[PDB]
Amino acid sequence: HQPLIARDGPHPVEQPVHNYMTKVIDRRALNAAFSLATEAIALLTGEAL
Amino acid sequence: HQPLIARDGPHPVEQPVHNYMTKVIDRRALNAAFSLATEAIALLTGEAL
């Protein structure tokens, strides 16, 4: 919303104005990947001990 | 009310007078700041309830 002044004389009368605006959000995405070492998976999961 | 200073010799002699000045007042007027719309005027009173 806006404030007004009270102009005098040879001019149009200032009238109150209000301004509504609509602005839209944005979607993005990030990523990372730790590929785990093959035999070490078997070494941690059991059945190589 | 003005002062003066005594003055010697060949100068002419001065004498006190006074000043009473008058001035008018200017007229300034201003106007601003209101408006409404029909859909409210129906709704703020009587009709659209």
Side-chain angles (χ1 to χ4, degrees), chain A residues 1-7 9-13 15-38 40-46 48-49, chain B residues 1-7 9-13 15-38 40-49:
Chain A
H1 311 286
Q2 283 183 351
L4 282 78
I5 312 172
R7 298 290 309 280
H11 293 89
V13 173
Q15 61 183 358
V17 291
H18 308 291
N19 288 322
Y20 292 159
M21 66 181 77
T22 172
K23 288 182 284 186
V24 189
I25 74 104
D26 293 331
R27 297 286 171 85
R28 296 178 78 261
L30 288 81
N31 46 5
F34 58 109
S35 65
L36 185 60
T38 300
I41 300 157
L43 175 50
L44 61 89
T45 190
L49 287 87
Chain B
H1 303 279
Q2 60 195 358
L4 67 93
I5 283 93
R7 190 164 182 84
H11 311 93
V13 182
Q15 59 188 359
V17 294
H18 306 288
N19 288 117
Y20 295 102
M21 77 177 79
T22 58
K23 56 178 70 177
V24 298
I25 299 176
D26 291 328
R27 299 297 304 274
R28 293 180 183 271
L30 49 93
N31 51 355
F34 197 78
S35 175
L36 287 175
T38 299
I41 301 160
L43 183 62
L44 290 176
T45 171
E47 176 174 355
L49 284 81

Coordinates of all heavy atoms in Angstrom, one line a residue, unseen atoms left out:
Chain A
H1 N 0.8 -1.2 0.0 CA 0.0 0.0 0.0 C 0.9 1.2 0.0 O 2.1 1.2 0.3 CB -0.9 0.0 1.2 CG -1.6 -1.3 1.4 ND1 -2.7 -1.7 0.6 CD2 -1.4 -2.3 2.3 CE1 -3.1 -2.9 1.0 NE2 -2.3 -3.3 2.0
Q2 N 0.3 2.4 -0.4 CA 1.1 3.6 -0.5 C 0.5 4.8 0.3 O -0.7 4.9 0.5 CB 1.2 4.0 -2.0 CG 2.1 3.2 -2.8 CD 2.2 3.7 -4.2 OE1 1.4 4.5 -4.6 NE2 3.2 3.2 -5.0
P3 N 1.4 5.7 0.7 CA 0.9 6.9 1.3 C 0.7 8.1 0.3 O 1.2 8.0 -0.8 CB 2.1 7.3 2.3 CG 3.3 6.7 1.6 CD 2.8 5.5 0.9
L4 N -0.1 9.1 0.7 CA -0.4 10.2 -0.2 C 0.0 11.5 0.3 O 0.3 11.6 1.5 CB -1.9 10.2 -0.5 CG -2.6 9.3 -1.5 CD1 -2.7 7.9 -0.8 CD2 -3.9 9.8 -1.9
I5 N 0.0 12.5 -0.5 CA 0.2 13.9 -0.1 C -1.1 14.6 -0.4 O -2.0 13.9 -1.0 CB 1.4 14.5 -0.8 CG1 2.6 13.6 -0.7 CG2 1.9 15.7 -0.1 CD1 3.8 14.0 -1.5
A6 N -1.3 15.8 -0.1 CA -2.5 16.6 -0.2 C -2.3 17.8 -1.1 O -2.3 18.9 -0.6 CB -3.1 16.9 1.1
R7 N -1.8 17.6 -2.3 CA -1.6 18.6 -3.4 C -2.6 19.7 -3.4 O -3.8 19.5 -3.2 CB -1.5 17.9 -4.8 CG -0.5 16.9 -5.0 CD 0.9 17.5 -5.0 NE 1.0 18.6 -6.0 CZ 1.1 18.5 -7.3 NH1 1.1 17.3 -7.9 NH2 1.1 19.6 -8.0
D8 N -2.2 20.9 -3.8 CA -3.0 22.1 -3.8 C -3.0 22.7 -5.2 O -1.9 22.8 -5.8 CB -2.5 23.1 -2.7
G9 N -4.1 23.1 -5.7 CA -4.2 23.9 -6.8 C -4.4 23.2 -8.2 O -5.1 22.2 -8.3
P10 N -3.7 23.7 -9.2 CA -4.0 23.4 -10.6 C -3.6 22.0 -11.1 O -2.9 21.9 -12.1 CB -3.3 24.5 -11.4 CG -2.0 24.7 -10.5 CD -2.5 24.5 -9.1
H11 N -4.1 21.0 -10.4 CA -3.6 19.7 -10.6 C -4.7 18.7 -10.3 O -5.7 19.1 -9.6 CB -2.4 19.3 -9.7 CG -1.2 20.1 -10.1 ND1 -0.9 21.4 -9.5 CD2 -0.2 19.9 -10.9 CE1 0.2 21.8 -10.0 NE2 0.7 20.9 -10.9
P12 N -4.7 17.5 -10.9 CA -5.7 16.5 -10.5 C -5.5 16.1 -9.0 O -4.4 16.2 -8.4 CB -5.3 15.3 -11.4 CG -4.7 15.9 -12.6 CD -3.9 17.0 -12.1
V13 N -6.6 15.7 -8.4 CA -6.6 15.3 -7.0 C -6.0 13.9 -6.9 O -6.4 13.0 -7.5 CB -8.1 15.3 -6.4 CG1 -8.1 14.8 -5.0 CG2 -8.6 16.8 -6.5
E14 N -5.0 13.8 -6.0 CA -4.3 12.6 -5.7 C -5.3 11.6 -5.0 O -5.9 12.0 -4.1 CB -3.1 12.8 -4.9
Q15 N -5.4 10.4 -5.6 CA -6.3 9.4 -5.0 C -5.5 8.2 -4.5 O -4.4 7.9 -5.0 CB -7.3 9.0 -6.1 CG -6.7 8.4 -7.3 CD -7.7 8.0 -8.4 OE1 -8.9 8.2 -8.2 NE2 -7.3 7.5 -9.5
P16 N -5.9 7.5 -3.5 CA -5.2 6.4 -3.0 C -5.2 5.2 -3.9 O -6.2 4.9 -4.5 CB -5.9 6.1 -1.6 CG -6.6 7.3 -1.3 CD -7.0 7.9 -2.6
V17 N -4.0 4.6 -4.0 CA -3.9 3.4 -4.9 C -3.3 2.3 -4.1 O -2.6 2.5 -3.1 CB -3.0 3.7 -6.1 CG1 -3.8 4.7 -7.0 CG2 -1.7 4.4 -5.7
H18 N -3.6 1.0 -4.5 CA -3.1 -0.1 -3.9 C -2.7 -1.1 -5.0 O -3.3 -1.1 -6.0 CB -4.0 -0.8 -2.9 CG -4.6 0.2 -1.9 ND1 -3.8 0.7 -0.9 CD2 -5.8 0.7 -1.8 CE1 -4.6 1.5 -0.2 NE2 -5.8 1.5 -0.7
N19 N -1.6 -1.8 -4.8 CA -1.0 -2.7 -5.8 C -0.8 -4.1 -5.3 O 0.0 -4.3 -4.4 CB 0.3 -2.0 -6.3 CG 0.0 -0.8 -7.2 OD1 -1.0 -0.7 -7.9 ND2 0.8 0.2 -7.0
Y20 N -1.4 -5.0 -6.0 CA -1.3 -6.4 -5.6 C -0.5 -7.1 -6.7 O -0.8 -7.0 -7.9 CB -2.7 -7.1 -5.5 CG -3.5 -6.6 -4.3 CD1 -4.9 -6.7 -4.3 CD2 -2.9 -6.0 -3.2 CE1 -5.6 -6.3 -3.2 CE2 -3.6 -5.5 -2.2 CZ -4.9 -5.7 -2.1 OH -5.7 -5.2 -1.1
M21 N 0.5 -7.9 -6.4 CA 1.3 -8.6 -7.3 C 1.5 -10.0 -6.9 O 1.5 -10.4 -5.8 CB 2.7 -7.9 -7.5 CG 3.6 -7.9 -6.3 SD 5.2 -7.1 -6.5 CE 4.7 -5.4 -6.3
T22 N 1.8 -10.8 -7.9 CA 1.8 -12.3 -7.7 C 3.1 -12.8 -8.4 O 3.3 -12.7 -9.6 CB 0.6 -13.0 -8.2 OG1 0.7 -14.4 -8.1 CG2 0.1 -12.5 -9.6
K23 N 4.0 -13.4 -7.6 CA 5.3 -13.9 -8.0 C 5.5 -15.4 -7.5 O 5.2 -15.7 -6.4 CB 6.4 -13.0 -7.5 CG 6.4 -11.7 -8.3 CD 7.6 -10.8 -7.8 CE 7.2 -10.2 -6.5 NZ 8.3 -9.2 -6.1
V24 N 6.0 -16.2 -8.5 CA 5.9 -17.6 -8.4 C 7.2 -18.2 -8.0 O 8.3 -17.7 -8.3 CB 5.4 -18.2 -9.8 CG1 5.1 -19.7 -9.7 CG2 4.3 -17.4 -10.3
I25 N 7.2 -19.3 -7.2 CA 8.4 -19.9 -6.7 C 9.1 -20.8 -7.7 O 8.5 -21.0 -8.8 CB 8.0 -20.8 -5.4 CG1 7.3 -22.1 -5.7 CG2 7.0 -20.0 -4.6 CD1 8.2 -23.3 -5.6
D26 N 10.3 -21.3 -7.4 CA 11.1 -22.0 -8.3 C 11.6 -23.3 -7.7 O 12.0 -23.4 -6.5 CB 12.3 -21.2 -8.7 CG 11.9 -20.0 -9.6 OD1 10.9 -20.1 -10.2 OD2 12.6 -19.0 -9.5
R27 N 11.6 -24.4 -8.5 CA 12.0 -25.7 -8.1 C 13.4 -26.1 -8.7 O 13.5 -26.0 -9.9 CB 11.0 -26.8 -8.4 CG 9.7 -26.6 -7.7 CD 9.8 -27.0 -6.3 NE 8.6 -26.6 -5.6 CZ 7.5 -27.4 -5.5 NH1 7.5 -28.5 -6.2 NH2 6.5 -26.9 -4.9
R28 N 14.3 -26.4 -7.9 CA 15.6 -27.0 -8.4 C 16.0 -28.2 -7.5 O 15.4 -28.5 -6.5 CB 16.7 -25.9 -8.4 CG 16.5 -24.7 -9.3 CD 17.6 -23.7 -9.1 NE 18.8 -24.1 -9.8 CZ 19.9 -24.7 -9.3 NH1 19.8 -25.0 -8.0 NH2 20.9 -25.0 -10.0
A29 N 17.0 -28.9 -8.0 CA 17.4 -30.1 -7.3 C 19.0 -30.3 -7.4 O 19.6 -29.8 -8.3 CB 16.8 -31.3 -8.1
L30 N 19.5 -30.9 -6.4 CA 20.9 -31.2 -6.2 C 21.1 -32.7 -6.2 O 20.2 -33.4 -6.0 CB 21.5 -30.5 -5.0 CG 21.7 -29.0 -5.0 CD1 20.4 -28.3 -4.6 CD2 22.8 -28.6 -4.0
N31 N 22.4 -33.1 -6.2 CA 22.7 -34.5 -6.3 C 24.2 -34.8 -6.0 O 25.0 -33.9 -6.1 CB 22.4 -35.1 -7.7 CG 22.8 -34.2 -8.8 OD1 23.5 -33.2 -8.6 ND2 22.5 -34.6 -10.0
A32 N 24.5 -36.0 -5.5 CA 25.8 -36.5 -5.3 C 25.7 -38.0 -5.1 O 24.6 -38.5 -4.7 CB 26.5 -35.9 -4.0
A33 N 26.8 -38.7 -5.4 CA 26.8 -40.2 -5.4 C 28.1 -40.7 -5.0 O 29.1 -40.5 -5.6 CB 26.4 -40.6 -6.8
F34 N 28.1 -41.6 -4.0 CA 29.2 -42.3 -3.5 C 29.2 -43.8 -3.9 O 28.6 -44.6 -3.2 CB 29.5 -42.1 -2.0 CG 28.4 -42.5 -1.1 CD1 28.5 -43.6 -0.3 CD2 27.3 -41.6 -0.9 CE1 27.6 -43.9 0.6 CE2 26.3 -42.0 0.0 CZ 26.5 -43.1 0.8
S35 N 29.6 -44.1 -5.1 CA 29.7 -45.5 -5.6 C 30.6 -46.3 -4.7 O 31.8 -46.0 -4.5 CB 30.1 -45.6 -7.0 OG 31.5 -45.1 -7.1
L36 N 30.1 -47.4 -4.1 CA 30.8 -48.1 -3.1 C 31.5 -49.3 -3.7 O 31.0 -50.0 -4.7 CB 29.8 -48.6 -2.0 CG 30.4 -49.3 -0.8 CD1 31.4 -48.4 -0.1 CD2 29.3 -49.7 0.2
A37 N 32.7 -49.7 -3.2 CA 33.6 -50.6 -3.8 C 33.1 -52.0 -3.7 O 32.7 -52.5 -2.5 CB 35.0 -50.5 -3.2
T38 N 33.1 -52.8 -4.8 CA 32.4 -54.1 -4.9 C 32.7 -55.1 -3.9 O 31.8 -55.6 -3.3 CB 32.7 -54.6 -6.3 OG1 32.3 -53.7 -7.3 CG2 32.0 -55.9 -6.6
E39 N 34.0 -55.5 -3.8 CA 34.3 -56.6 -2.9 C 34.2 -56.2 -1.4 O 33.9 -57.0 -0.6 CB 35.8 -57.0 -3.2
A40 N 34.3 -54.9 -1.2 CA 34.2 -54.4 0.2 C 32.8 -54.4 0.7 O 32.5 -54.5 1.9 CB 34.7 -52.9 0.2
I41 N 31.8 -54.4 -0.3 CA 30.4 -54.6 0.1 C 30.2 -56.0 0.6 O 29.5 -56.2 1.6 CB 29.5 -54.4 -1.2 CG1 29.7 -52.9 -1.7 CG2 28.1 -54.6 -0.8 CD1 29.3 -52.8 -3.1
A42 N 30.8 -57.0 -0.1 CA 30.8 -58.4 0.4 C 31.5 -58.5 1.7 O 31.2 -59.4 2.6 CB 31.3 -59.3 -0.7
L43 N 32.6 -57.7 1.9 CA 33.3 -57.8 3.1 C 32.6 -57.2 4.3 O 32.9 -57.6 5.5 CB 34.7 -57.1 2.9 CG 35.7 -56.8 3.9 CD1 36.0 -58.1 4.7 CD2 36.9 -56.4 3.2
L44 N 31.7 -56.3 4.1 CA 30.9 -55.7 5.2 C 29.6 -56.4 5.4 O 29.2 -56.5 6.6 CB 30.7 -54.2 4.9 CG 29.9 -53.7 3.7 CD1 28.4 -53.6 3.9 CD2 30.4 -52.4 3.2
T45 N 29.0 -57.0 4.4 CA 27.7 -57.5 4.5 C 27.7 -58.9 5.2 O 26.6 -59.4 5.4 CB 27.0 -57.7 3.1 OG1 25.6 -58.0 3.3 CG2 27.6 -58.8 2.3
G46 N 28.8 -59.4 5.5 CA 28.9 -60.8 5.9 C 29.2 -61.7 4.7 O 29.4 -61.3 3.6
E47 N 29.3 -63.0 5.1 CA 29.6 -64.1 4.1 C 30.9 -64.0 3.4 O 31.1 -64.5 2.3 CB 28.5 -64.3 3.1
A48 N 31.9 -63.1 3.9 CA 33.3 -63.3 3.6 C 34.0 -63.1 4.9 O 34.5 -62.0 5.2 CB 33.8 -62.4 2.5
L49 N 34.1 -64.1 5.8 CA 34.7 -64.0 7.1 C 35.2 -65.4 7.4 O 34.6 -66.4 7.1 CB 33.8 -63.6 8.2 CG 33.3 -62.1 8.3 CD1 32.0 -61.9 7.5 CD2 33.0 -61.8 9.8
Chain B
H1 N 10.3 51.4 15.8 CA 10.6 52.7 16.3 C 12.1 52.9 16.2 O 12.8 52.2 17.0 CB 10.1 52.9 17.7 CG 8.6 52.7 17.8 ND1 7.7 53.7 17.4 CD2 7.8 51.7 18.1 CE1 6.5 53.3 17.6 NE2 6.5 52.0 18.0
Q2 N 12.6 53.8 15.3 CA 14.0 53.8 15.0 C 14.8 54.7 15.9 O 14.2 55.7 16.5 CB 14.1 54.3 13.6 CG 13.6 55.7 13.3 CD 13.3 56.0 11.9 OE1 13.7 55.2 11.0 NE2 12.8 57.2 11.6
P3 N 16.0 54.4 16.2 CA 16.8 55.4 17.0 C 17.5 56.3 16.0 O 17.4 56.2 14.8 CB 17.8 54.5 17.7 CG 18.1 53.4 16.7 CD 16.7 53.2 16.0
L4 N 18.3 57.3 16.5 CA 19.2 58.1 15.7 C 20.3 58.6 16.6 O 20.4 58.4 17.8 CB 18.5 59.2 15.0 CG 17.9 60.4 15.7 CD1 18.8 61.6 15.7 CD2 16.6 60.8 14.9
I5 N 21.3 59.3 15.9 CA 22.5 59.8 16.5 C 22.6 61.3 16.2 O 22.4 61.7 15.1 CB 23.7 59.0 16.1 CG1 23.8 57.6 16.8 CG2 25.0 59.8 16.2 CD1 23.1 56.5 16.0
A6 N 22.9 62.0 17.3 CA 23.1 63.5 17.2 C 24.3 63.8 16.3 O 25.3 63.1 16.4 CB 23.3 64.1 18.5
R7 N 24.2 64.8 15.4 CA 25.2 65.0 14.4 C 25.5 66.5 14.4 O 24.7 67.3 14.4 CB 24.6 64.6 13.0 CG 25.6 64.5 11.9 CD 25.1 63.7 10.7 NE 26.0 63.7 9.7 CZ 27.0 62.8 9.6 NH1 27.2 61.9 10.6 NH2 27.9 62.8 8.6
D8 N 26.8 66.7 14.3 CA 27.4 68.1 14.6 C 27.5 68.8 13.3 O 27.5 68.3 12.2 CB 28.7 68.0 15.3
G9 N 27.6 70.2 13.4 CA 28.2 71.0 12.4 C 27.3 71.2 11.2 O 26.1 71.4 11.3
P10 N 27.9 71.1 10.0 CA 27.2 71.6 8.8 C 26.2 70.6 8.3 O 25.4 70.9 7.4 CB 28.3 71.7 7.8 CG 29.3 70.7 8.2 CD 29.3 70.7 9.7
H11 N 26.1 69.4 8.9 CA 25.0 68.5 8.5 C 23.7 69.0 8.9 O 23.6 69.7 10.0 CB 25.3 67.1 9.2 CG 26.7 66.7 9.0 ND1 27.7 67.0 10.0 CD2 27.3 66.0 8.0 CE1 28.9 66.4 9.6 NE2 28.7 65.9 8.4
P12 N 22.6 68.7 8.2 CA 21.3 69.1 8.7 C 20.8 68.2 9.8 O 21.3 67.1 9.9 CB 20.4 68.9 7.4 CG 21.1 67.8 6.7 CD 22.6 68.0 6.9
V13 N 20.0 68.7 10.6 CA 19.5 68.1 11.8 C 18.5 67.0 11.5 O 17.6 67.3 10.6 CB 19.0 69.1 12.9 CG1 18.6 68.4 14.2 CG2 20.0 70.1 13.1
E14 N 18.6 65.8 12.0 CA 17.6 64.7 11.8 C 16.5 64.8 12.9 O 16.7 65.4 13.9 CB 18.3 63.4 11.8
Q15 N 15.4 64.1 12.6 CA 14.3 64.0 13.5 C 13.7 62.7 13.4 O 13.6 62.0 12.4 CB 13.3 65.2 13.2 CG 12.8 65.1 11.8 CD 11.9 66.3 11.5 OE1 11.8 67.2 12.3 NE2 11.4 66.4 10.2
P16 N 13.2 62.1 14.5 CA 12.6 60.8 14.5 C 11.2 60.7 13.8 O 10.4 61.5 14.1 CB 12.5 60.4 16.0 CG 13.4 61.3 16.7 CD 13.3 62.6 15.9
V17 N 11.0 59.7 12.9 CA 9.7 59.3 12.5 C 9.7 57.8 12.7 O 10.6 57.2 13.1 CB 9.3 59.7 11.1 CG1 9.2 61.3 11.0 CG2 10.3 59.2 10.1
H18 N 8.5 57.2 12.3 CA 8.3 55.8 12.6 C 7.7 55.1 11.4 O 7.4 55.8 10.4 CB 7.3 55.7 13.8 CG 7.8 56.4 15.0 ND1 8.8 56.0 15.7 CD2 7.3 57.6 15.5 CE1 9.0 56.9 16.7 NE2 8.1 57.9 16.6
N19 N 7.6 53.8 11.4 CA 7.0 53.1 10.3 C 6.0 52.1 10.8 O 6.3 51.3 11.8 CB 8.1 52.3 9.6 CG 9.0 53.2 8.7 OD1 10.2 53.4 8.9 ND2 8.3 53.9 7.8
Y20 N 4.8 52.1 10.2 CA 3.7 51.2 10.5 C 3.3 50.6 9.2 O 2.6 51.2 8.4 CB 2.6 51.9 11.2 CG 2.9 52.5 12.5 CD1 3.1 53.9 12.7 CD2 2.9 51.7 13.6 CE1 3.4 54.4 13.9 CE2 3.1 52.2 14.9 CZ 3.4 53.6 15.0 OH 3.7 54.1 16.3
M21 N 3.7 49.4 8.9 CA 3.4 48.7 7.7 C 2.3 47.7 7.9 O 2.2 47.1 9.0 CB 4.6 48.1 6.9 CG 5.1 46.8 7.5 SD 6.5 46.1 6.5 CE 7.8 47.1 7.1
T22 N 1.6 47.4 6.9 CA 0.4 46.5 6.9 C 0.6 45.5 5.8 O 1.0 45.9 4.7 CB -0.9 47.3 6.7 OG1 -0.8 48.0 5.4 CG2 -1.1 48.3 7.8
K23 N 0.2 44.2 6.0 CA 0.4 43.2 5.0 C -0.8 42.3 5.1 O -1.3 42.0 6.2 CB 1.7 42.4 5.2 CG 1.9 41.8 6.5 CD 3.2 41.1 6.5 CE 4.4 42.0 6.4 NZ 5.7 41.3 6.4
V24 N -1.3 41.8 3.9 CA -2.5 40.9 3.8 C -2.1 39.5 4.1 O -0.9 39.1 4.1 CB -3.2 41.1 2.5 CG1 -3.7 42.5 2.4 CG2 -2.3 40.8 1.4
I25 N -3.1 38.6 4.2 CA -2.9 37.2 4.4 C -3.3 36.5 3.1 O -4.4 36.7 2.6 CB -3.7 36.7 5.6 CG1 -3.1 37.4 6.9 CG2 -3.5 35.2 5.8 CD1 -3.9 37.0 8.1
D26 N -2.5 35.6 2.6 CA -2.8 34.8 1.4 C -3.7 33.6 1.8 O -3.7 33.1 2.9 CB -1.5 34.3 0.8 CG -0.7 35.4 0.1 OD1 -1.4 36.4 -0.3 OD2 0.5 35.3 0.1
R27 N -4.4 33.1 0.8 CA -5.4 32.0 1.0 C -5.0 30.8 0.1 O -4.9 30.9 -1.1 CB -6.8 32.5 0.6 CG -7.3 33.6 1.4 CD -7.4 33.2 2.8 NE -8.3 32.1 3.0 CZ -9.6 32.1 3.0 NH1 -10.2 33.3 3.0 NH2 -10.3 31.0 3.2
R28 N -4.7 29.7 0.8 CA -4.3 28.5 0.1 C -5.1 27.3 0.6 O -5.3 27.1 1.8 CB -2.8 28.2 0.4 CG -1.9 29.2 -0.2 CD -0.4 28.8 0.1 NE 0.5 29.8 -0.4 CZ 1.0 29.8 -1.7 NH1 0.7 28.8 -2.5 NH2 1.9 30.7 -2.1
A29 N -5.5 26.5 -0.3 CA -6.4 25.4 0.0 C -5.9 24.1 -0.8 O -5.5 24.3 -1.9 CB -7.9 25.7 -0.3
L30 N -6.1 23.0 -0.2 CA -5.7 21.7 -0.7 C -6.8 20.7 -0.6 O -7.7 20.9 0.1 CB -4.4 21.3 0.0 CG -4.4 21.3 1.5 CD1 -4.8 20.0 2.1 CD2 -3.1 21.8 2.1
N31 N -6.6 19.6 -1.4 CA -7.7 18.6 -1.4 C -7.1 17.2 -1.8 O -6.3 17.2 -2.8 CB -8.9 19.0 -2.3 CG -8.4 19.4 -3.7 OD1 -7.2 19.5 -4.0 ND2 -9.4 19.7 -4.5
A32 N -7.6 16.1 -1.2 CA -7.0 14.8 -1.5 C -7.8 13.6 -1.0 O -8.8 13.7 -0.2 CB -5.6 14.7 -0.9
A33 N -7.4 12.4 -1.5 CA -7.3 11.2 -0.7 C -8.5 10.3 -0.5 O -8.4 9.5 0.5 CB -6.6 11.4 0.6
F34 N -9.6 10.3 -1.3 CA -10.6 9.3 -1.0 C -11.3 8.9 -2.3 O -11.5 9.6 -3.2 CB -11.6 9.9 -0.1 CG -12.5 8.9 0.6 CD1 -12.1 8.2 1.6 CD2 -13.8 8.8 0.1 CE1 -12.9 7.2 2.2 CE2 -14.7 7.8 0.7 CZ -14.2 7.1 1.7
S35 N -11.7 7.6 -2.3 CA -12.5 7.0 -3.4 C -13.1 5.6 -2.9 O -12.6 5.0 -2.0 CB -11.7 6.7 -4.6 OG -12.4 6.0 -5.6
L36 N -14.2 5.2 -3.5 CA -14.8 3.9 -3.3 C -15.4 3.3 -4.6 O -15.4 4.0 -5.6 CB -16.0 4.0 -2.3 CG -15.5 4.2 -0.8 CD1 -16.8 4.4 0.0 CD2 -14.8 3.0 -0.4
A37 N -15.8 2.1 -4.5 CA -16.4 1.4 -5.6 C -17.7 0.8 -5.3 O -18.0 0.5 -4.1 CB -15.4 0.3 -6.1
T38 N -18.5 0.5 -6.4 CA -19.9 0.2 -6.2 C -20.1 -1.1 -5.5 O -21.0 -1.3 -4.7 CB -20.6 0.2 -7.6 OG1 -20.4 1.5 -8.2 CG2 -22.0 -0.2 -7.5
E39 N -19.3 -2.1 -5.8 CA -19.4 -3.5 -5.2 C -19.2 -3.4 -3.7 O -19.7 -4.3 -3.0 CB -18.4 -4.4 -5.9
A40 N -18.5 -2.5 -3.2 CA -18.4 -2.3 -1.7 C -19.6 -1.6 -1.2 O -20.1 -2.0 -0.1 CB -17.1 -1.5 -1.4
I41 N -20.1 -0.6 -1.9 CA -21.2 0.2 -1.4 C -22.5 -0.6 -1.3 O -23.3 -0.4 -0.4 CB -21.4 1.5 -2.3 CG1 -20.1 2.2 -2.3 CG2 -22.5 2.4 -1.8 CD1 -19.9 3.1 -3.4
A42 N -22.7 -1.5 -2.2 CA -23.8 -2.5 -2.1 C -23.5 -3.4 -0.9 O -24.4 -3.8 -0.2 CB -23.8 -3.4 -3.3
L43 N -22.2 -3.7 -0.6 CA -21.9 -4.7 0.4 C -21.7 -4.2 1.8 O -21.9 -4.9 2.8 CB -20.6 -5.4 -0.1 CG -20.1 -6.6 0.7 CD1 -21.1 -7.8 0.7 CD2 -18.8 -7.0 0.0
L44 N -21.3 -2.9 1.9 CA -21.1 -2.3 3.2 C -22.4 -1.9 3.9 O -22.4 -1.7 5.1 CB -20.2 -1.1 3.2 CG -18.7 -1.2 2.8 CD1 -18.1 0.1 2.7 CD2 -18.0 -2.1 3.9
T45 N -23.5 -1.9 3.2 CA -24.8 -1.5 3.8 C -26.0 -2.1 3.1 O -26.1 -2.0 1.9 CB -24.8 0.1 3.8 OG1 -26.2 0.5 4.2 CG2 -24.4 0.7 2.5
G46 N -26.8 -2.7 3.9 CA -28.2 -3.0 3.4 C -28.3 -4.1 2.4 O -28.9 -5.1 2.7
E47 N -27.8 -3.8 1.2 CA -28.1 -4.6 0.0 C -27.6 -6.0 0.1 O -28.4 -7.0 0.1 CB -27.5 -3.9 -1.2 CG -27.7 -4.6 -2.5 CD -27.3 -3.8 -3.7 OE1 -27.0 -2.6 -3.5 OE2 -27.3 -4.3 -4.8
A48 N -26.3 -6.2 0.1 CA -25.7 -7.5 -0.2 C -25.5 -8.5 0.9 O -25.0 -9.5 0.8 CB -24.4 -7.3 -1.0
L49 N -26.0 -8.1 2.1 CA -26.0 -9.0 3.2 C -27.1 -10.1 3.0 O -28.3 -9.8 2.8 CB -26.3 -8.2 4.6 CG -25.2 -7.4 5.2 CD1 -25.0 -6.0 4.5 CD2 -25.3 -7.3 6.7

